[PDB]
Amino acid sequence: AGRISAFLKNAWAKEPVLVVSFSVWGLAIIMPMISPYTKYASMINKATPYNYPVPVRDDGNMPDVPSHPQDPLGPSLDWLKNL
Amino acid sequence: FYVREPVNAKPNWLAVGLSVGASVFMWIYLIQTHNEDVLEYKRRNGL
Amino acid sequence: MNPITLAIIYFTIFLGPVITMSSTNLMLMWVGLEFSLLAIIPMLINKKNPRSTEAATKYFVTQATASMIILLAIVLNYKQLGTWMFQQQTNGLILNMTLMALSMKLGLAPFHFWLPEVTQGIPLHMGLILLTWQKIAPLSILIQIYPLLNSTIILMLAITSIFMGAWGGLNQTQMRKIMAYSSIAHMGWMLAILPYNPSLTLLNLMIYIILTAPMFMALMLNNSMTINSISLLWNKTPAMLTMISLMLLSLGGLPPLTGFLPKWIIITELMKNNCLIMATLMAMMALLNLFFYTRLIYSTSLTMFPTNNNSKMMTHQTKTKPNLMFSTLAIMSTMTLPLAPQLI
Amino acid sequence: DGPEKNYEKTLAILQIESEKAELRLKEQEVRRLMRARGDGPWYQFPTPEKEFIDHSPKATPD
Amino acid sequence: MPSTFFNLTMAFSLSLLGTLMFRSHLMSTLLCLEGMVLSLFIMTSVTSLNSNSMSSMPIPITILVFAACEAAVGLALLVKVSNTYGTDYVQNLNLLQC
Amino acid sequence: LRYGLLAAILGDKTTKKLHEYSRVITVDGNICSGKNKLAKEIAQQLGMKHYPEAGIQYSSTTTGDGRPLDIEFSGSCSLEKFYDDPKSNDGNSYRLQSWLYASRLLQYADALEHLLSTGQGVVLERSIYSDFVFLEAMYNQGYIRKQCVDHYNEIKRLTLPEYLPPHAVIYIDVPVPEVQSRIQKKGDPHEMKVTSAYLQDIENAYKKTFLPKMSEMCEVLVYDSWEAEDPTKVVEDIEYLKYNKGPWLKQDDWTFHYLRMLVQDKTEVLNYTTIPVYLPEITIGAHQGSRIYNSFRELPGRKYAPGYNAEVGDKWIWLK
Amino acid sequence: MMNGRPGHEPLKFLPDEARSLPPPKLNDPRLVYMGLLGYCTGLMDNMLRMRPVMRAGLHRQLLFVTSFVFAGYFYLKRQNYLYAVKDHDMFGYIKLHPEDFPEKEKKTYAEILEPFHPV
Amino acid sequence: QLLREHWVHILVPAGFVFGCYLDRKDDEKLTAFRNKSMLFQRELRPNEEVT
Numbered sequence A: 001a002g003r004i005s006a007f008l009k010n011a012w013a014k015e016p017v018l019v020v021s022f023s024v025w026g027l028a029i030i031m032p033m034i035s036p037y038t039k040y041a042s043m044i045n046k047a048t049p050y051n052y053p054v055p056v057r058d059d060g061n062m063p064d065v066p067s068h069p070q071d072p073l074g075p076s077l078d079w080l081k082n083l
Numbered sequence B: 001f002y003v004r005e006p007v008n009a010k011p012n013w014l015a016v017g018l019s020v021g022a023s024v025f026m027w028i029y030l031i032q033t034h035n036e037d038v039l040e041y042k043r044r045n046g047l
Numbered sequence C: 001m002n003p004i005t006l007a008i009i010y011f012t013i014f015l016g017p018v019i020t021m022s023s024t025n026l027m028l029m030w031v032g033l034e035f036s037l038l039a040i041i042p043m044l045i046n047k048k049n050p051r052s053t054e055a056a057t058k059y060f061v062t063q064a065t066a067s068m069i070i071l072l073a074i075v076l077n078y079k080q081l082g083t084w085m086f087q088q089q090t091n092g093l094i095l096n097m098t099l100m101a102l103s104m105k106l107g108l109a110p111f112h113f114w115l116p117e118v119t120q121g122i123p124l125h126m127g128l129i130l131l132t133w134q135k136i137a138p139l140s141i142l143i144q145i146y147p148l149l150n151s152t153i154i155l156m157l158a159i160t161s162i163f164m165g166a167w168g169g170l171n172q173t174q175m176r177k178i179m180a181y182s183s184i185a186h187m188g189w190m191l192a193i194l195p196y197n198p199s200l201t202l203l204n205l206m207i208y209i210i211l212t213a214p215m216f217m218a219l220m221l222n223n224s225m226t227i228n229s230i231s232l233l234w235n236k237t238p239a240m241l242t243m244i245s246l247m248l249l250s251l252g253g254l255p256p257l258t259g260f261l262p263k264w265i266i267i268t269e270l271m272k273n274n275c276l277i278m279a280t281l282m283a284m285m286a287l288l289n290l291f292f293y294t295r296l297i298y299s300t301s302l303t304m305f306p307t308n309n310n311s312k313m314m315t316h317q318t319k320t321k322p323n324l325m326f327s328t329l330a331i332m333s334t335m336t337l338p339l340a341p342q343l344i
Numbered sequence D: 001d002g003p004e005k006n007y008e009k010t011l012a013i014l015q016i017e018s019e020k021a022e023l024r025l026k027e028q029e030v031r032r033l034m035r036a037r038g039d040g041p042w043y044q045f046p047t048p049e050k051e052f053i054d055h056s057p058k059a060t061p062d
Numbered sequence E: 001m002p003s004t005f006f007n008l009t010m011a012f013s014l015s016l017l018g019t020l021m022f023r024s025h026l027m028s029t030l031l032c033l034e035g036m037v038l039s040l041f042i043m044t045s046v047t048s049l050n051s052n053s054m055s056s057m058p059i060p061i062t063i064l065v066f067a068a069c070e071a072a073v074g075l076a077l078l079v080k081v082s083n084t085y086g087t088d089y090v091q092n093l094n095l096l097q098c
Numbered sequence F: 001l002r003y004g005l006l007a008a009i010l011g012d013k014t015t016k017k018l019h020e021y022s023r024v025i026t027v028d029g030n031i032c033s034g035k036n037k038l039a040k041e042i043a044q045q046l047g048m049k050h051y052p053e054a055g056i057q058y059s060s061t062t063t064g065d066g067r068p069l070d071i072e073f074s075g076s077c078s079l080e081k082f083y084d085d086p087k088s089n090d091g092n093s094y095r096l097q098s099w100l101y102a103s104r105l106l107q108y109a110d111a112l113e114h115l116l117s118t119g120q121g122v123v124l125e126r127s128i129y130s131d132f133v134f135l136e137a138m139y140n141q142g143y144i145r146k147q148c149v150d151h152y153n154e155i156k157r158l159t160l161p162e163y164l165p166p167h168a169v170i171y172i173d174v175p176v177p178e179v180q181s182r183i184q185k186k187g188d189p190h191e192m193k194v195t196s197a198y199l200q201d202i203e204n205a206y207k208k209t210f211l212p213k214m215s216e217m218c219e220v221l222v223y224d225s226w227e228a229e230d231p232t233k234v235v236e237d238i239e240y241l242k243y244n245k246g247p248w249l250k251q252d253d254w255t256f257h258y259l260r261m262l263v264q265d266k267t268e269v270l271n272y273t274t275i276p277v278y279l280p281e282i283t284i285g286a287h288q289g290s291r292i293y294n295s296f297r298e299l300p301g302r303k304y305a306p307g308y309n310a311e312v313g314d315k316w317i318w319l320k
Numbered sequence G: 001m002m003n004g005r006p007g008h009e010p011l012k013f014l015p016d017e018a019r020s021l022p023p024p025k026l027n028d029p030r031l032v033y034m035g036l037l038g039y040c041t042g043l044m045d046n047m048l049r050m051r052p053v054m055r056a057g058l059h060r061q062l063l064f065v066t067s068f069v070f071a072g073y074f075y076l077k078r079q080n081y082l083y084a085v086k087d088h089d090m091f092g093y094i095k096l097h098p099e100d101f102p103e104k105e106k107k108t109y110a111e112i113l114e115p116f117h118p119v
Numbered sequence H: 001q002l003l004r005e006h007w008v009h010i011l012v013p014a015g016f017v018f019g020c021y022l023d024r025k026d027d028e029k030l031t032a033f034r035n036k037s038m039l040f041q042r043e044l045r046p047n048e049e050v051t
Ligand SMILES: Nc1ncnc2c1ncn2[C@@H]1O[C@H](COP(=O)(O)OP(=O)(O)O)[C@@H](O)[C@H]1O
Pocket: F030, F031, F032, F033, F034, F035, F036, F037, F053, F096, F097, F100, F125, F134, F191
């Protein structure tokens, strides 16, 4: 309605600083809630080997990557390229 | 005749019909909880 | 003082003990003493008279070093056997600085010289909280350490609290310090027992809270902080006497009233744990806690002191007491001894 | 009603009232032993839980 | 380590020996209260560090906020003493004792 | 709900209600100078309401049936018996006053509820702060101990600063050989036979202590009796009264809250008038008092709260 | 002291065991006492505010006479567990440890003396 | 009738009755060694109880 769009335009001109604050406040929190790429914040950040990946010994199970890792099994992340 | 007209002149009908309605519930939930217990006390053990 | 400020401070007072309750580290269990401390100084100081500004400093310095001295023992306990809890095999001096500190939070042996002084020069509301709620979080430290306090000194603090918590109670004539000096003398019972079945001091706290609140809630009705200022209650509200009578004689334990029960059931632990010589002293000098109640009650009901002519106005103004607060407590005490099996 | 109803009533109390002495002397002595050698449920003071440790690899021997 | 712990625990002990003795002030009392803090801070920084207890490493901040949050109001009182007396002596406030 | 604190959050504010004429206002003078044709004829000229002088019985006239009572139920003043014989050990010269002090204090306190609810001005007359005028002349002459005056100013010390000033007082000076004449011009024998010196010590102590210390908190409108008798001019003198130099301005709506919950509890207004302090002049003793309060609750109408009395109505005397 | 035992649902008032216990009678020395105890409260609240004693709520009373009784039922319905576990835990400890609680209660008063302290 | 200016006179004897019942509820609570006492130990005629 017109009762609010005046206070917008009015409080804007007489205080056009806090609006950018009260915007960026509520606007910083809405954009993650609508993004496609927010999922990748953790993926990219979970794939980071700051620590040696300790291996595991074959018991004739877990059909995952072989010893020589150059086998496409396992999470051979290629999405990160051509992100 | 109470020149300063008191805060309690008419009954607070909001609360009295509300308090009693709480008590009666407080009576019945108690009882049905007891008989349920005495009932279940029997079949929980042998009898 | 602004409601936006009120329900954020009453909030913090409620958090300090509860954080202290609802936590396992000795660190969350420390900070909780500080929400309990940071949220008192605001309301100790509302009138902003000198008699409030002096108490806070006299309260703050006394109840900061205590926080530090607690805060020492943790760090020692994180050097020694690195973790954040008094586990079992921690050195005795550590606790004997912990218990030292809590005894400064509460006021037992010489550490009581501040508590009534603070309780003097203060409103009753926010005087109520020093003695009933703020008193818990120090104990929330302490029911944790069920065994393993040095039984030697924890008893020394009791008697010296019972002595000083009584003799001091004789001289004084303002309600505010008497109710305070009994907080001491109703602590050695909270405290002597403490290694010996401390689901029984938890009681005396749930008791002693039930006995002080009605009194303050009674003094709040008239804002009378003095024997004479309350002596003339027969003119103001001669109906409140029959509870203040039963409230006090309950508070200093006489049997048919409930307040005997902690002072009795405690001794049922202590004699059972082989200390004939000691606990006798408490119950005897406890009778001295009746003398400045039996002198008090003389001023109150048992002979109607002289009053002021100006009180004739006071019998026109339709006083208003609270509900759920005074009678509902004043009869959960003074009449509830014979449910003691159910209490305990 | 009669002494046939007293003398018998009294013994009923004694069976009720003597038994109490035995239980308390037991219930104390139990409470004594369950402390000095914490073996029963009473006076089992808590220790930190197993299930807030990571059993995973961190760095070579930990 | 131990060649600095006991040296700190002594320095702490002086700070406690300190804030229990007065010489005609409240601030020095109020101020020696923070060597009592800071000597506990460091001795918490060391143990949580030399133990490689990076999980306990948050705690030195949690204390250090309240190393000041209590202190700040502690400062705030003095303005409400000096505004009363204007002197900041501890021997000026002996009238809660009547 | 008795204004609570909820009503301050839901909205029961004061500054939303105030007015240019939401101004408490007082008149002062002497014992037959104006104030009955002045005070009335000012509330009406402007729009606000009016309160008369505080009688001995203003407490009784404002509760229950609003009726007056026996002397003993309302102090033991007997102002009529004051003038014809003071200097008795049956101390009447102070009881006459403190009993009136509290009543002025209640009257002033009765104002602030209505001043702070449907905010209108409040015409008082000889409010609290002019009350020592009666005492100074009364101690400068032989009527009261020195030890008993301190019992007054001590009680004044406890209740006066807890309230606001009277907000533009008025005083009508008048020469003492005239006011002694107006008493004779009125058909009262008791107001006669008063020492004219007392009515000269009345206003010489007035203008030395009252008048100066009030011109700084409030704003005075000193007038003469013939400058009165024409309340048209003074009404418009109020209009040019630029309100400053008082504590009304240095306090938000929340002081009014703790000011208004202080005053709605009329019993809490007076906890520092029934102080334990014991004089032979005002301390009564037990039986003399117990007899009264017991006979006073037997009275037809109190006996109980002022909500529950079968004998003056109160049909539903078992729920409400 | 009980609080650390096994079989412990902490902060479960009414553990959902104790449901195998016989509940109260509704008519015992303590609830009906607690009932009168509630009545003596509303008696006194009115007596403090200068209302007519023995009347003047007639719903406030009935609240207290229930609010305690409704409370006294559950609270009694708890402690009756606590004493029961205070017994249950005890005797079980005794049968897992018979080696330390023997029973030889005494001989008769014929194979035994007491010093006849005459007067 | 009228507003029952005297009804308390019913009040006390309702207690003596209630006491004689509570005194009797005590009795059937104990109700043991009804005949197992060495002293009496008398088997009755064909009928049922003693106390
Ligand atoms: N403490 C007191 N001592 C003497 N007279 C008093 C006192 N308090 C009130 N009065 C009386 O109040 C009266 C006021 O009457 P008057 O000035 O004629 O009209 P108004 O009632 O408008 O002031 C005076 O006659 C005065 O004697």
